[PDB]
Amino acid sequence: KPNYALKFTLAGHTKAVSSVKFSPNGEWLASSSADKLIKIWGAYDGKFEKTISGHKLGISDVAWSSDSNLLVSASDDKTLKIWDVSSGKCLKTLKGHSNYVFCCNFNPQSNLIVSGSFDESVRIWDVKTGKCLKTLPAHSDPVSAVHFNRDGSLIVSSSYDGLCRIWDTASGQCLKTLIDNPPVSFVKFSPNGKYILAATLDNTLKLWDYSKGKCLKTYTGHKNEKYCIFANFSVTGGKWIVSGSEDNLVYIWNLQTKEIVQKLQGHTDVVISTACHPTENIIASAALENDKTIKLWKSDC
């Protein structure tokens, strides 16, 4: 069992936090908020580093390029924005979604950005030029998550329509649809790319084998009925599943046995987002409007 303990509480967002992500070099945490801002904090000392601004409306998601030099943000103003982290300046504004942009991610090469929107489409963008390369009619309801696999050849998407879909990046064609219809609020590939972790709004997380299309594991005990809450594979120490919860707790499960091994307390509102540090046993969690803070937790395993 892990022993995550609170080390820092990061204040400064003036509305609900929507997503937190560690930089791939392990050095930074980026947070996006309904307050229209991105904030950059030190991963190991919790020190506030900078505020990044320019979106006209709230931000639902943020993601790092592989070299930790760029961010992409997804906003209610219907655009994504590509930022140089060092200078904080907006390099590109990615226009073309006709409704709120909900989720974003770089591919491993980080020449491409994938986005999902309330307009039910998934879009693939060229990082250098800001042009939309492809628009996939991915879903019949808002798209809750998008994620590249380890080489970027696949995109996985989830939606309130109840579907998980795996797309071939190069062609944009749908390679597989997981239908086995509760609303899917989050999805992401496992680090090796063989498995897919999907959250449904019936208080359930499921671990699927992509190539077999089979639910391998089910993780329960948390409250997830309304919000799109991030989940993670924790691999730095023990192999855990990590998720936020609507009871203001961070849940940690043993991946293989599906048993809850820890529940982190301290947030005062829905823990909308959790993220796992790339090298250290460190978790970042973030909560909604009644809390507005980010918390850093450290474990010996």
Binding site: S18, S33, A34, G58, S60, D76, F102, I272, E289
Partner: peptide, 8 residues
């Protein structure tokens, strides 16, 4: 506000 903080 933002679409994630709103929910449903």
């Amino acid at each position: 506000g933002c679409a994630r903080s709103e929910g449903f």
